[PDB]
Amino acid sequence: MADEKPKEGVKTENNDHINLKVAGQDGSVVQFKIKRHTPLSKLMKAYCERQGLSMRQIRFRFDGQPINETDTPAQLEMEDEDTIDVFQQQTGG
């Protein structure tokens, strides 16, 4: 899936995508890489696949505020190698 290959002349700031982490309520954390313009949809699924749980049964919050899969890591301008808190709330079902 590393089919991203620009013939650009990047010299000063060689950056593209950043690393993120998701801490689960179980005390485990996953380390992954996501692009700035890449939707959290893949993020939520990535962690879900790793931990072996349902994304519909969990929630993601960052910096005190909640984030939906429809948001991007650039939308709130998070830092590289930052972490997101995950909690699994079964309420009413």
3 burial type by CB count under 10 A (0-12 exposed, 13-18 middle, 19+ buried): exposed
Which strands sit side by side in the sheet containing 82-87, from one edge to the other?
29-35, 17-23, 82-87, 59-62, 65-66
Any idea where the domains of the chain sit in the sequence? 1-93
Longest dimension (CA), the chain: 54
